[PDB]
Enzyme design. Structure first.
Site, PDB file in Angstrom:
ATOM      1  N   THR A  96     -86.512  -6.308  64.908  1.00 57.40           N
ATOM      2  CA  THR A  96     -85.426  -5.428  65.317  1.00 57.40           C
ATOM      3  C   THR A  96     -85.882  -4.000  65.543  1.00 57.40           C
ATOM      4  O   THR A  96     -86.346  -3.322  64.629  1.00 57.40           O
ATOM      5  CB  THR A  96     -84.293  -5.424  64.280  1.00 57.40           C
ATOM      6  OG1 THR A  96     -83.803  -6.759  64.092  1.00 57.40           O
ATOM      7  CG2 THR A  96     -83.172  -4.500  64.703  1.00 57.40           C
ATOM      8  N   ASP A 155     -83.475  -5.377  71.284  1.00 63.44           N
ATOM      9  CA  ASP A 155     -84.283  -6.579  71.406  1.00 63.44           C
ATOM     10  C   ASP A 155     -83.618  -7.670  70.578  1.00 63.44           C
ATOM     11  O   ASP A 155     -83.047  -7.411  69.525  1.00 63.44           O
ATOM     12  CB  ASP A 155     -85.716  -6.218  71.025  1.00 63.44           C
ATOM     13  CG  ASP A 155     -85.799  -5.511  69.686  1.00 63.44           C
ATOM     14  OD1 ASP A 155     -84.750  -5.120  69.143  1.00 63.44           O
ATOM     15  OD2 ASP A 155     -86.903  -5.132  69.268  1.00 63.44           O
ATOM     16  N   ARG A 164     -84.208 -10.661  68.991  1.00 62.56           N
ATOM     17  CA  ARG A 164     -84.841 -11.581  68.065  1.00 62.56           C
ATOM     18  C   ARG A 164     -84.202 -11.355  66.704  1.00 62.56           C
ATOM     19  O   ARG A 164     -84.398 -10.301  66.095  1.00 62.56           O
ATOM     20  CB  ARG A 164     -86.352 -11.379  68.007  1.00 62.56           C
ATOM     21  CG  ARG A 164     -86.991 -12.337  67.046  1.00 62.56           C
ATOM     22  CD  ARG A 164     -88.485 -12.170  66.920  1.00 62.56           C
ATOM     23  NE  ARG A 164     -89.212 -12.587  68.106  1.00 62.56           N
ATOM     24  CZ  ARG A 164     -90.507 -12.366  68.275  1.00 62.56           C
ATOM     25  NH1 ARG A 164     -91.186 -11.731  67.331  1.00 62.56           N
ATOM     26  NH2 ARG A 164     -91.113 -12.762  69.382  1.00 62.56           N
ATOM     27  N   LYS A 180     -77.017  -6.928  69.522  1.00 63.62           N
ATOM     28  CA  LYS A 180     -76.862  -5.805  68.623  1.00 63.62           C
ATOM     29  C   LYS A 180     -76.128  -4.616  69.214  1.00 63.62           C
ATOM     30  O   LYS A 180     -75.753  -3.716  68.457  1.00 63.62           O
ATOM     31  CB  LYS A 180     -78.220  -5.357  68.077  1.00 63.62           C
ATOM     32  CG  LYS A 180     -78.762  -6.380  67.107  1.00 63.62           C
ATOM     33  CD  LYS A 180     -80.038  -5.927  66.454  1.00 63.62           C
ATOM     34  CE  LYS A 180     -81.175  -5.948  67.409  1.00 63.62           C
ATOM     35  NZ  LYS A 180     -81.512  -7.356  67.735  1.00 63.62           N
ATOM     36  N   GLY A 210     -81.149  -3.831  60.448  1.00 66.06           N
ATOM     37  CA  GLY A 210     -81.178  -4.184  59.041  1.00 66.06           C
ATOM     38  C   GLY A 210     -80.310  -5.393  58.791  1.00 66.06           C
ATOM     39  O   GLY A 210     -80.447  -6.409  59.472  1.00 66.06           O
ATOM     40  N   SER A 249     -87.156  -2.022  62.212  1.00 67.98           N
ATOM     41  CA  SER A 249     -88.445  -2.223  61.564  1.00 67.98           C
ATOM     42  C   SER A 249     -89.588  -1.736  62.438  1.00 67.98           C
ATOM     43  O   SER A 249     -90.552  -1.155  61.933  1.00 67.98           O
ATOM     44  CB  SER A 249     -88.638  -3.694  61.207  1.00 67.98           C
ATOM     45  OG  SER A 249     -88.789  -4.475  62.375  1.00 67.98           O
ATOM     46  N   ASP A 258     -94.390  -5.174  67.266  1.00 63.27           N
ATOM     47  CA  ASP A 258     -93.780  -5.498  65.981  1.00 63.27           C
ATOM     48  C   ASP A 258     -93.685  -7.005  65.825  1.00 63.27           C
ATOM     49  O   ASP A 258     -93.649  -7.744  66.810  1.00 63.27           O
ATOM     50  CB  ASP A 258     -92.403  -4.862  65.827  1.00 63.27           C
ATOM     51  CG  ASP A 258     -91.927  -4.854  64.395  1.00 63.27           C
ATOM     52  OD1 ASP A 258     -92.463  -4.064  63.590  1.00 63.27           O
ATOM     53  OD2 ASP A 258     -91.026  -5.663  64.076  1.00 63.27           O
ATOM     54  N   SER A 286     -89.868  -7.963  65.994  1.00 67.62           N
ATOM     55  CA  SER A 286     -89.350  -7.718  67.325  1.00 67.62           C
ATOM     56  C   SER A 286     -89.829  -8.791  68.294  1.00 67.62           C
ATOM     57  O   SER A 286     -90.898  -9.382  68.124  1.00 67.62           O
ATOM     58  CB  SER A 286     -89.748  -6.326  67.803  1.00 67.62           C
ATOM     59  OG  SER A 286     -89.265  -5.340  66.913  1.00 67.62           O
TER      60      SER A 286
END
Lengths: 250, 199, 228, 204, 239, 48, 220, 232
Positions: G1, G17, G19, G33, G47, G129, G166, G169
């Site tokens: 994220t 993104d 995922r 999101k 989160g 993250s 990431d 991500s």
């Protein structure tokens, strides 16, 4: 702050309760129901109080309220107090099913609602519920049933019921045409058609002004048949042909 | 600690328990009774945290007697079992939990016999033969070896005899005397007390 | 014309308490007499029917093992107070290892003889005669609905209390004995009752420093009545 | 963990015009099994099921609570319930216990009540919805069922290949798992009818 | 809530609603009850049924325990509430002390509830009057009645409902010890008392007995018909 | 048959039925009064 | 994220993104999101997912209520004040990493909310993250008062670097553009990853699995 | 607040709720209104007269949305109207929190009628003097729901409430039919509003809102001024 207080709980000095009887005389107007339990099924009958030409009939329901899978109730009295009652009653039966995971038997349902009504008759000065209402239903222990709620909290099982003041003569008619368990579902319907034909003074019983719902016993379904209008029409035609056959005796 | 067994049949339920009351290291009472007659065809046994057993008997027993005296008739075993599970499941997520582990034994006129099965986490189960404890381990192999769903009651008594003979053979506990009930269409019949003479 | 129930009078008293003092008067009579040998006490049951089983009507009830009582008029308002008075005497003996004296009992009762109100209902309708033997010798005590509690040496209550008090002040003095006071009470009883005095009408309750507990079973009453 | 107290696995798979949901039968206390007939897939009206996995207490508790609210909703409104509505209801019911959480991972699989449109979604233990198009899984043996469904899934599936695909997926992903086994029940539903088959799984 | 005192004393020393709620009892159905020495009997008259409907719901005699029995008068709804609370109380007593519940305890509970109900803030007093017949330990038959005041009050035979003065006058000239010698005669004595009461067609005569080591048996209304028939035979034998 | 009919009938109702049945009788030139006369009179006095 | 936000010369460009990882396993390949608040204000979450969902639905309900009560367009500062007051009342238990953006009468306003209740007004934020990589790309290639396609390319580039770095991500990239008049919302912007077609058809046959017990229930 | 809690609502000797009959009379003494359902949409229309020439027509609003697809007018007293409007606002958002779906109009009328009925039972309070006309386009078929002070509710094809509701209703029985378009609904609605109002009816004396299946829409004085050409 006490001279304004209305005292709707204290007995009257004639000897009975005062506000209770006037709630009963509020039952007596605007309403006329009955049902005919006499095997394999039970039915309800109802009169349109708002039979005006500018409604919608889009509710797929009327006076009947399917309160569970296997119980409905006919209303008579002030309508929206009964909506308060049907919401609370439906929620009571559903909490019972939540508590046991077995469907709710009809007499502890009736006594729960009767205790609610007596709870507002007994203490405070609150206005009593001006709603009497019927009960059809099924159980594991007796089969098909009929019950009569009263604004006092008194109840009583019947085999042929009555609420509205127009239907006391119907109880006279139900006694004069009493049967000992003979509900082939055409005999009981013709009898109910005959009763509502005689008791209401609406000449020839237009089928838009009436309402008939039945409850039959199926193994896995327990269907509630809020039946449509065409069978009511041909039922009226059947009964008027049988009244013409019945007055060949003169 | 111990275990009380509950073998179900075609038309009977064979429940049994001990007469043992544990302590620190001593056997305080050698004629204890774990049997809590809910109704005329519904029994209840209880093992767990030993302060909760009697109060569960109080709650369940008395509320079932309330239903029977109010409405005029006896509960099904299934609804009573679910009612016990509900009071466990409500009592779990609080400041005051109950820790008991017992199976429930009833008999319907229509459903016939019925055996249920609890846990200290309020789980229902409909079992042919169930268990709890440490005798659970040493006894379910013997019971699952010699089971027939259409088994007669004297064969079940002999099977229970065999199960006890494997309880007194490789166990670190005493377990001297077992009481045995049976449930039928007639009601609660008490069978003879199943002991072994020691000396 | 319904006023507030917590209204005093144009003259001064109240209303509802005064109506309670009126409501005492319909009740049955009772007579208690303090004597230094011990406190004796008497009452009338007022048996109405023969279908009415006579030994079940309670007039003398038991507060402590040494504190007696008698009630009047309304029965059940008295029953609440008797229960609570017992509870508070048990609290005193518990938290103090000693006997709550009869004056302290009656202070604890007339603390809420009038707590009648709408928040935090009506005044109670019973007159009470309290006896027993504390450390101050025998004691005889009388309260009212208004909480106006006083000691009385030999008080008579209820419906025949006028001639009872008068003819009681005729016969009473300070150095009476027990049995003389017992028959002196029941003479007044069978002058103020309506039915024939027999084994089933009245009941006694005497508590002594010697006869330690109030004990009065039947048929010594027969021996007392045939002594007339 | 607390999720590995009783085992459990629920798989739902969307086909072409139909949807298939399956779960295991085993019930027991971490290493000791008890029964082979524990119900984890519940009927919520017609042509719409829900699956529950995790701790069995919360399984039966949430199933009865949801049945309570579901019948109250279907009696307050004469129509039957749309699946997004049911998803939001389960989300609100789980989120009421935000800090007192149930231990369950509900999986909803049902058809459209108006059209024949399938629907699948899954939730977490606090109420996080997730709508996909292929499959959702829940339980201990997640990675096994992920490997199976990302290995075997096709977009447009007749119910026979749907049944065989979910059959092979459940059998193989359960057989690699330890604490979850002892039989498979499979519900394969469509616009016309509802089919329930049980597979010949390893009883070990 | 409702901060008011409904029941005020009178200017001449009454409670209006306690003495006046007895009138609602006075305008209800009649019910008698006697105790024999080994078999107890009671029953209500004047069901005043519609003769063509159900009757299992209008039952005016119920039980709280396997030991205790009910009857009442007045209006039926307050009886329903009081019976529900009495069932709860007797079973909660069984929760504690392991005896069967004594009848004197349940009558004290009913009368205590009734008095603290009349005392309280704005609660209308219960216009009923119950009969509580049971035979506790060592087989002793006892019977108590209630009152809207809340006075449990032990009797030997009953006089409530409509015209209770007439019924008690018949029991007055019928207090024979001989009548409680034969259990059958005690049953017939209840039938004759209720026959000296209302129509007594043998339709509204609902009676139930307990032989103190069993539970209550509601009698099928053909046995009551033969009881009335042999009562009429003895009445003919009187001439 | 008439006593059982109304649970709280008075002598007013009795006079009303006993005269309305006669009014039904002399409507059709008769002397004696049949059962349906009482039925119509019952349905005329009570429920209107 | 890895979510990001930016303010160009007229409005706000938001990205995401999709995922939804659960632990270490990809639980979703297509999620959402970027949430609705009002016709002009949107929000992104990071989160704990269900916390962000329930919180943003409550605040969107309250602002729809307030806007329908008033009869005009909502203000962003009201959303900010409601969010910070609620999240501070929960004492940081609810983890909801929010990026708040909308266009008021005053213009574009971007706020980031940290789950204790600490808020900041910024021209550009990154949350999640893998937010560090996108904030690196922003600080590398940002200039004040960019244009529209420049900002879209920048946000796409930033979230693309976050997806290629990431571990939590990586999916197809969500975008959203808010102006004074034009609201746009574009899910499959520049789908970076393909998937190889299967090399073996591992299709089963009609009857390759033993069946023990069938049932049929007809319908209407 | 004080401990009284007693309902001032008492049945009559006959059995009649005198405060509800009086509340119905207080409704009947209010400003007239009409609302018509006609196959594709629902039209609501009120009659909003300023007392002087001083008053502003941009401040107070009769036609009021409850959600994005649910309109609501009244015929009674605005001071109670706004209160129960605000209640219906707060109530609809709890449904949209629970189910994440826009509330059906029947469910609104159920809950609002429950509130109003429950409030006339409640103690020391008078009933509302307000009759509603609720409408919306939920699940294809549009609806129209009238309530009343007694707590009841109905479902109409076309109705009116206020002054001369009998005359407007007799005009509605003759004028309306089964099938019309939104424009013809506006035509017959301004006709029946023109039945009882004063002669000067402008872009401000009336105030008209419509409903589409595409959502609720509250028309402006611009299109209202556009409409009264070849008026009624």
């Amino acid at each position: 702050s006490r001279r304004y207080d209305s005292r709707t709980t204290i007995f009257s000095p004639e000897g009975r309760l005062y506000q209770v009887e006037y709630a009963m005389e509020a039952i007596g107007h605007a309403g006329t129901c009955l049902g005919i339990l006499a095997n394999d099924g039970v039915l309800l009958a109802a009169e349109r109080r708002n039979i005006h030409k500018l409604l919608d009939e889009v509710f797929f329901s009327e006076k009947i309220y399917k309160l569970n899978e296997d119980m409905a109730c006919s209303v008579a009295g002030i309508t929206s107090d009964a909506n308060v009652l049907t919401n609370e009653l439906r929620l009571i039966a559903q909490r019972y099913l939540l508590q046991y995971q077995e469907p709710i038997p009809c007499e502890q349902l009736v006594t729960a609602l009767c205790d609610i009504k007596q709870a507002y008759t007994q203490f405070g000065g609150k206005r009593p519920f001006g709603v009497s209402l019927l009960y059809i239903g099924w159980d594991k222990h007796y089969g098909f049933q009929l019950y009569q709620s009263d604004p006092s909290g008194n109840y009583g099982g019947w085999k042929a019921t009555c609420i509205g003041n127009n239907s006391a003569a119907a109880v006279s008619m139900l006694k004069q045409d009493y049967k000992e368990g003979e509900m082939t579902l055409k005999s009981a319907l013709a009898l109910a058609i005959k009763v509502l034909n005689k008791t209401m003074d609406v000449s020839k019983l237009s089928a838009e002004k009436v309402e008939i719902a039945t409850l039959t016993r199926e193994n896995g379904k327990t269907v509630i048949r809020v039946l449509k209008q065409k069978e009511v029409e041909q039922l009226i035609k059947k009964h008027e042909e049988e009244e013409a056959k019945a007055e060949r005796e003169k | 600690m111990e275990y009380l067994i509950g073998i179900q049949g075609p038309d009977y339920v064979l429940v049994a328990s001990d007469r043992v009351a544990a302590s620190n290291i001593v056997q305080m009472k050698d004629d204890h009774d774990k049997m809590f007659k809910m109704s005329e065809k519904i029994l209840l046994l209880c093992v767990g945290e030993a302060g909760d057993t009697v109060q569960f008997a109080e709650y369940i027993q008395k509320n079932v007697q309330l239903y029977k005296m109010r409405n005029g008739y006896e509960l099904s075993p299934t609804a009573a079992a679910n009612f016990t599970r509900r009071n466990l499941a409500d009592c779990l997520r609080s400041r005051t939990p109950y820790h008991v582990n017992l199976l429930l034994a009833g008999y319907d006129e229509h459903e016939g016999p019925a055996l249920y099965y609890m846990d200290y986490l309020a789980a229902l189960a409909k079992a042919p033969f169930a268990a709890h404890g440490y005798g659970a381990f040493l006894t379910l192999s013997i019971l699952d070896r010699y089971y027939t769903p259409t088994i007669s009651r004297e064969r079940a008594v002999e099977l229970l005899r065999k199960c006890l003979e494997e309880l007194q053979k490789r166990f670190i506990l005493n377990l001297p005397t077992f009481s045995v009930r049976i449930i039928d269409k007639n009601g609660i019949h008490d069978l003879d007390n199943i002991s072994f003479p020691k000396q | 014309y319904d006023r507030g129930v917590n209204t005093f009078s144009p003259e001064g008293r109240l209303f509802q308490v005064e109506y309670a003092i009126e409501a005492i008067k319909l009740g049955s009579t009772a007579i208690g007499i303090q004597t230094s040998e011990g406190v004796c006490l008497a009452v009338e049951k007022r048996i109405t029917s023969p279908l009415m089983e006579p030994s079940s009507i309670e007039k003398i009830v038991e507060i402590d093992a040494h504190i007696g009582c008698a009630m009047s008029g309304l029965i059940a308002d008295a029953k609440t107070l008797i229960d609570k008075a017992r509870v508070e005497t048990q609290n005193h003996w518990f938290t103090y290892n000693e006997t709550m004296t009869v004056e302290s009992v009656t202070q604890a009762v007339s603390n809420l003889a009038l707590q009648f109100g709408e928040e935090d209902s009506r005044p109670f309708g019973v007159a009470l005669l309290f006896g027993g033997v504390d450390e101050k010798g025998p004691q005889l005590f009388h309260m009212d609905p208004s909480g106006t509690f006083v000691q009385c040496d030999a008080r008579a209550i209820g419906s025949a209390s006028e001639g009872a008090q008068s003819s009681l002040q005729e016969v009473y003095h300070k150095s009476m004995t027990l049995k003389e006071a017992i028959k002196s009470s029941l003479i007044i009883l069978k002058q103020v009752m309506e039915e024939k005095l027999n084994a089933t009408n009245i009941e006694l309750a005497t508590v002594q420093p010697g006869q330690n507990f109030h004990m009065f079973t039947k048929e010594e009453l027969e021996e007392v009545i045939k002594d007339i | 963990s607390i999720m590995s107290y009783n085992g459990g696995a629920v798989m739902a798979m969307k086909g072409k015009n139909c949807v298939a949901i399956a779960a295991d039968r085993r019930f027991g206390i971490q290493a000791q099994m008890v029964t082979t007939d524990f119900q984890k897939i519940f009927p919520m009206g017609d042509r719409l099921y829900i699956g529950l996995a995790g701790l069995a207490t919360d399984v039966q508790t949430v199933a009865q609570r949801l049945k309570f609210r579901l019948n109250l909703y279907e009696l307050k409104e004469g129509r039957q319930i749309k699946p997004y509505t049911l998803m939001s209801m389960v989300a609100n019911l789980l989120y009421e216990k935000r800090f007192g959480p149930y231990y369950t991972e509900p999986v909803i699989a049902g058809l459209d009540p108006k059209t024949f449109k399938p629907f699948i979604c899954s939730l977490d233990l606090i109420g996080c919805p997730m709508v996909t198009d292929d499959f959702v899984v829940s339980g201990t043996c997640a990675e096994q069922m992920y490997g199976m469904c990302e290995s075997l899934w096709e977009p447009n599936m007749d119910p026979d290949h749907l049944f065989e695909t979910i059959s092979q997926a459940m059998l193989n992903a359960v057989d690699r798992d330890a604490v979850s086994g002892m039989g498979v029940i499979v519900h394969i539903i469509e616009k016309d009818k509802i089919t329930t088959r049980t597979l010949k799984a390893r009883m070990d | 809530s409702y901060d008011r005192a409904i029941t005020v004393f009178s200017p001449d020393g009454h409670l209006f609603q306690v003495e006046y709620a007895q009138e609602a009892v006075k305008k209800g159905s009649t019910a008698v009850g006697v105790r024999g020495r080994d078999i107890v009997v009671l029953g209500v008259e004047k069901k005043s049924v519609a003769k063509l409907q159900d009757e299992r719901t209008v039952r005016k005699i119920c039980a709280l325990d396997d030991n205790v029995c009910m009857a009442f008068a007045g209006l039926t709804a307050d009886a329903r509430i009081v019976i529900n609370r009495a069932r709860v109380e007797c079973q909660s007593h069984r929760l504690t002390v392991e005896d069967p519940v004594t009848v004197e305890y349940i009558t004290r509970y009913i009368a205590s509830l009734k008095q603290r109900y009349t005392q309280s803030n704005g609660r209308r007093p219960f216009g009923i009057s119950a009969l509580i017949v049971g035979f506790d330990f060592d087989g002793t038959p006892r019977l108590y009645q209630t009152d809207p005041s809340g006075t449990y009050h032990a009797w030997k035979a009953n006089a409530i409902g409509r015209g209770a003065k007439s019924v008690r006058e018949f029991l007055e000239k019928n207090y024979t010890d001989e009548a409680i010698e034969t259990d059958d005669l005690t049953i017939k004595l209840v039938i004759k008392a209720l026959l000296e009461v209302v129509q007594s067609g043998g339709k509204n005569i609902e009676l139930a007995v307990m032989r103190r080591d069993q539970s209550l048996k509601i009698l099928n209304p053909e046995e009551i018909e033969k009881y009335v028939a042999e009562i009429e035979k003895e009445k003919e034998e009187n001439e | 048959d008439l006593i059982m009919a109304k649970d709280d009938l008075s002598g007013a109702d009795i006079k009303a039925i006993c005269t309305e049945a006669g009014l039904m009788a002399l409507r059709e030139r008769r002397m004696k009064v049949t059962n349906e006369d009482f039925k119509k009179s019952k349905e005329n006095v009570l429920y209107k | 994220t890895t979510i990001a936000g930016v303010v160009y010369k007229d409005g706000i460009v938001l990205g995401a993104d999709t995922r939804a990882t659960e632990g270490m396993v990809v639980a979703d390949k297509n999620c959402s999101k970027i949430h609705f608040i009002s016709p002009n204000i949107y929000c992104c979450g990071a989160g704990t997912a269900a916390d962000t969902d329930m919180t943003t639905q409550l605040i969107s309900s309250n602002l729809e209520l307030h806007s329908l009560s008033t009869g005009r367009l909502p203000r962003v500062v009201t959303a900010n004040r409601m969010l910070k007051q609620m999240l501070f009342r929960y004492q940081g238990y609810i983890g909801a990493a929010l990026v708040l953006g909308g266009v008021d009468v005053t213009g574009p306003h971007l706020y980031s909310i940290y789950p204790h209740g600490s808020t900041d007004k910024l021209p550009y934020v990154t949350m999640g993250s893998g937010s560090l990589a996108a904030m690196a790309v922003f600080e590398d290639k940002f200039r004040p008062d960019m244009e529209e396609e420049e900002a879209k390319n920048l946000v796409s580039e930033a979230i693309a670097a976050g997806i290629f770095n990431d571990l939590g991500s990586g999916s197809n990239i969500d975008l959203c553009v808010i102006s004074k008049n034009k609201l746009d919302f574009l899910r499959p912007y520049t789908v970076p990853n393909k998937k190889g077609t299967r090399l073996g058809r591992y299709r089963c046959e009609k009857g390759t699995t033993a069946v023990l017990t069938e049932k049929i229930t007809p319908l209407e | 607040e004080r401990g009284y809690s007693f309902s001032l609502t008492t049945f009559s000797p006959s059995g009649k709720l005198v405060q509800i009959e009086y509340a119905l009379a207080a409704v009947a003494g209010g400003a007239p209104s009409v609302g018509i359902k006609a196959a594709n949409g629902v039209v609501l229309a009120t009659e909003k007269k300023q007392k002087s020439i001083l008053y502003d027509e941009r401040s107070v609003h009769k036609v009021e949305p409850i959600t994005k697809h649910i309109g609501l007018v009244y015929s009674g007293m605005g001071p109670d109207y706004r209160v129960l409007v605000h209640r219906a606002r707060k109530l609809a958002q709890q449904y949209y929190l629970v189910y994440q779906e826009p509330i059906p109009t029947a469910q609104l009328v159920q809950r609002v009628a429950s509130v109003m009925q429950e409030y006339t039972q409640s103690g020391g309070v008078r009933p509302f003097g307000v009759s509603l006309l609720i409408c919306g386009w939920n699940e294809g078929r549009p609806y129209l729901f009238q309530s009343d002070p007694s707590g009841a509710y109905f479902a109409w094809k076309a109705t009116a409430m206020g002054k001369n509701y009998v005359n407007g209703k007799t005009f509605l029985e003759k004028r309306y039919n089964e099938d019309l378009e939104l424009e013809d609904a506006i035509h017959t609605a301004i006709l029946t509003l023109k039945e009882s109002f004063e002669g000067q009816m402008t872009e401000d004396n009336i105030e008209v809102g419509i409903c589409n299946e595409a959502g609720f829409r509250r028309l402006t004085p611009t299109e209202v001024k556009d409409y009264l050409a070849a008026i009624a």
